[PDB]
């Protein structure tokens, strides 16, 4: 029988290239623009990925759409943190193999202020020495981190699916012997990082929503992101979001 985490591991999507021509100089506008086009391709891959997570397709189609709309930024930022954490010990952002933002590229105007919220994720993964298995359980949990004010059409089932992946995160923590007040502290620490993603996403979405809405900025978003953003902007103004937390 295959374990649940091994099933999350085989569906881990391939690395996408940004298509960034480095023979041309950098600019903040050029990088932000390239990243949005990459972001849309990465979100399309996250849809294919979500559909293969055991249990996810059993939710009402409207709930599948809802979870993907609420969590896309959280999934994008968490996965970027992982790639950055695995790339080097240095303070870099590995957006793609052809677009790595080093300390020299961070000197670009307004670059550091958007990049620091993203650098926090890899910093926490380095500091907590997060494993591949813990990451895979945590990333699936980030997909199930927000729900509508009045919940989902398959809420009962969602709470069951969510519980299963919380238990799965527990199993990965224990697999790193370990035991026992040491384990409770690992669960505390990792679920605290999961909770802080809501704050990371809030900062990322402020940039995202502003650059989308202000057409004088000339910052393009592909169909995939434009659609999700158009749908999500009113949901953040009508309080139609219940951000799930492990620690109150």
């Amino acid at each position: 029988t295959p374990t649940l985490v091994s099933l999350l591991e085989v569906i881990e999507p391939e690395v996408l290239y940004a298509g960034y021509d480095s023979s041309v100089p950098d600019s903040t506008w050029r990088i932000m623009t390239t990243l949005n086009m990459l972001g849309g391709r990465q979100v399309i891959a996250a849809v294919k990925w979500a559909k293969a997570i055991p249990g996810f397709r059993n939710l009402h189609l409207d709930d599948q759409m809802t979870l993907l709309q609420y969590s896309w930024m959280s999934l994008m930022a968490f996965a970027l943190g992982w790639r950055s954490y695995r790339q080097s010990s240095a303070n870099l952002l590995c957006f793609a193999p052809d677009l790595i933002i080093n300390e020299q590229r961070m000197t670009l105007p307004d670059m550091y202020d958007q990049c620091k919220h993203m650098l926090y994720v890899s910093s926490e993964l380095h500091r907590l020495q997060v494993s591949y298995e813990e990451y895979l359980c945590m990333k699936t949990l980030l997909l199930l981190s927000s729900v509508p004010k009045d919940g989902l059409k398959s809420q009962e089932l969602f709470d069951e699916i969510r519980m299963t992946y919380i238990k799965e995160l527990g199993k990965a923590i224990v697999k790193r012997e370990g035991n026992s007040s040491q384990n409770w502290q690992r669960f505390y620490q990792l679920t605290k990082l999961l909770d802080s993603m809501h704050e990371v996403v809030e900062n990322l979405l402020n940039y995202c929503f502003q650059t989308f809405l202000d057409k004088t900025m000339s910052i393009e978003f592909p169909e995939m992101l434009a659609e999700i953003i158009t749908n999500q902007i009113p949901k953040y103004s009508n309080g139609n979001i219940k951000k799930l937390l492990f620690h109150q």
């Binding site: 849809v47 294919k48 559909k51 189609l61 759409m65 993907l68 709309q69 995939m224 659609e227």
Partner: peptide, 13 residues
């Protein structure tokens, strides 16, 4: 309406 997202969930793959 989330046309692309619905399409990607409804399509095969």
């Amino acid at each position: 309406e989330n046309a692309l997202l619905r399409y990607l969930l409804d399509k095969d793959d």
